[PDB]
Amino acid sequence: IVGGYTCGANTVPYQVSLNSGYHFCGGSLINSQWVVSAAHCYKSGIQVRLGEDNINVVEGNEQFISASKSIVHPSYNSNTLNNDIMLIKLKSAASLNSRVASISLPTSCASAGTQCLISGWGNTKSSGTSYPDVLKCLKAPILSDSSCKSAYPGQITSNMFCAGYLEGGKDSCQGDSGGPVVCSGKLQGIVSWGSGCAQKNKPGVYTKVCNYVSWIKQTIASN
Numbered sequence: 001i002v003g004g005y006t007c008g009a010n011t012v013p014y015q016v017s018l019n020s021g022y023h024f025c026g027g028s029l030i031n032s033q034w035v036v037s038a039a040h041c042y043k044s045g046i047q048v049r050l051g052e053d054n055i056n057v058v059e060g061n062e063q064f065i066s067a068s069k070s071i072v073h074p075s076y077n078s079n080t081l082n083n084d085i086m087l088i089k090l091k092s093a094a095s096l097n098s099r100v101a102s103i104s105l106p107t108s109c110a111s112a113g114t115q116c117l118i119s120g121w122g123n124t125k126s127s128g129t130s131y132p133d134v135l136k137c138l139k140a141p142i143l144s145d146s147s148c149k150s151a152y153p154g155q156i157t158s159n160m161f162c163a164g165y166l167e168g169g170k171d172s173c174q175g176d177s178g179g180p181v182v183c184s185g186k187l188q189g190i191v192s193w194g195s196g197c198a199q200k201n202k203p204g205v206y207t208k209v210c211n212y213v214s215w216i217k218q219t220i221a222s223n
């Protein structure tokens with residue numbers, strides 16, 4: 001997250017870190033057994049880390065649970081990033097508490113202008129590279145479809161939305177992918193892509209989670 005703030009330990013209790021020897025992507029806990037992330041984050045051998053603040057130090061609220069399976073969306077295209085969503089099942093259920101909690105799925109799609117909280121452990125600089133160890137947060141609005149399309153001609157599908165600031169300065173970034181965009185207490189987005197970070201006229205692009213609720217629920221119901 002570029003241009004954000006330190007969230008505070010365990011203030012974003014549905015945020016998980018995906019670890020394969022190291023943090024590589026975020027995710028969102030949606031019930032005790034399942035995490036939502038980005039399909040472009042798929043790999044084998046994922047360990048889900050819950051209850052994290054400083055991802056380099058054991059601080060006492062973590063739960064580390066290996067994935068028993070990953071399910072990438074049936075229509076994910078890694079060239080266009082259309083349908084950039086996957087589900088990850090935990091080998092055992094998380095212990096839910098005030099610091100490890102699931103985020104409800106939306107009932108309807110959020111509108112442009114709605115305020116959202118975007119979070120992750122990604123790079124904090126537009127130019128060059130500095131990772132944070134503690135979780136970062138950014139409040140940002142959803143942008144109109146028309147401005148998202150004008151920002152990225154030929155590349156915004158009906159499964160994507162933009163959020164952030166056309167002026168630049170404040171955006172998600174590398175290492176935040178797969179993490180949450182929460183608006184009015186529901187998961188509306190997944191950190192997906194953009195062109196650099198925090199550049200003028202290049203806001204972040206997010207998977208539109210409200211399009212996937214019926215796939216999510218029916219996949220969980222049979223896996």
Ligand SMILES: NCc1cccc(-n2cccc2)c1
Pocket residue numbers: 171172173174175176177191192193194195196197198203204205
């Ligand atoms: N600024 C949005 C965004 C989201 C997620 C990743 C990236 N990114 C990856 C490499 C460089 C930037 C950007």
Ligand SMILES: [Ca+2]
Pocket residue numbers: 052053054055056057058059062
């Ligand atoms: Ca930790």
